[PDB]
Structure to design on (255 residues):
């Protein structure tokens, strides 16, 4: 991997500290290299590596990962099976943040407009 | 008419339940405490205003949501099928409470708007059945 990027299973990763909202973070990742985007996390092993990497780069270890809108394409249904049409669900776009604690790692969601540090990834 | 203390609206009967239960337990309660009962389904703005008035008493309590019968029934913890990069979402690691696949009325809008929240969380709710 290039200077500043760390290697893990044929991919290159890099954590960026300066906070940004999800979309600008994604753009910034795409600019750094071909095939680079906010990191998708496919297993606990990949997750562990990215977490240790973040701990070295971030004082406040929270970072955007590649999951924008976990509630995209949901299929809302009424328990009485009435047809779903009228709706008052108006949640704005939310994005995923990976948090690294001393005893564990977990993900939670925040408005995509919030500013968070982030991590990029691309196939070598 | 409606039985006991249930309130009528557009040919249905409704009842606000103060004892908190998770979404599944609330739905079951509604099925057990009323003939063909279920957590409330809200199919129009008018019905929503009626339900909001029905639960106006919960504005003083600490609970910020009231269960309604809407949810995504899948086994998965979220809906989006893919990561930003196109790969499939399979492995996920949500903190407790961060998988939100059931819906409830929101206290901030005086119980008019709905929000998806943790199905296992405990909240008061509303039952509905056809008269
Ligand atoms: C992220 O920042 C850019 C530029 O500042 C802005 O255009 C975009 O709308 C922001 N995204 C959100 C969700 O606010
Ligand atoms: Cl159901």
């Amino acid at each position: 991997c290039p200077l500043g990027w760390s290697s893990f299973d044929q991919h290159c990763y890099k954590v960026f500290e300066p906070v940004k909202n999800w979309t600008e973070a994604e753009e910034i990742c795409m600019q750094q290299h071909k095939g680079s985007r906010l990191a998708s996390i496919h297993s606990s092993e990949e997750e562990a590596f990215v977490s240790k990497l973040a701990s070295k780069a971030l004082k406040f270890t929270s970072m955007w990962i590649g999951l924008n809108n976990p509630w995209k394409d949901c299929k809302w249904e009424w328990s009485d099976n009435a047809r779903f049409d009228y709706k008052a669900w108006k949640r704005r776009p939310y994005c995923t943040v990976m948090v690294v604690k001393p005893d564990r790692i977990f993900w939670f969601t925040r408005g995509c407009e919030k500013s968070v540090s982030f991590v990029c990834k691309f196939l070598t | 008419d409606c039985p006991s203390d249930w309130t009528a609206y557009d040919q249905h009967c409704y009842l606000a339940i103060g004892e908190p239960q998770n979404w599944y337990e609330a739905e079951r309660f509604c099925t057990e405490q009323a003939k063909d009962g279920h957590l409330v389904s809200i199919q129009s703005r008018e019905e929503g205003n009626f339900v909001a008035q029905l639960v106006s008493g919960f504005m003083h309590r600490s609970e910020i949501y009231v269960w309604i019968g809407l949810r995504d029934r899948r086994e998965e913890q979220q809906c989006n099928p893919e990561w930003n990069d196109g790969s499939k979402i399979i492995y996920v690691n949500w903190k407790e409470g961060e998988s939100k696949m059931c819906q409830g009325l929101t206290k901030w809008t005086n119980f008019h708007d709905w929000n998806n929240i943790n199905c296992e969380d405990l909240y008061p709710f509303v039952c509905k059945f056809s008269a």
Summary: Helices of chain B lie at 23-33, 45-54. Residues 62 and 114 of chain B are 17 Å apart (CA to CA). The first helix of chain B runs from residue 23 to 33. Chain B has one domain: 1-131.
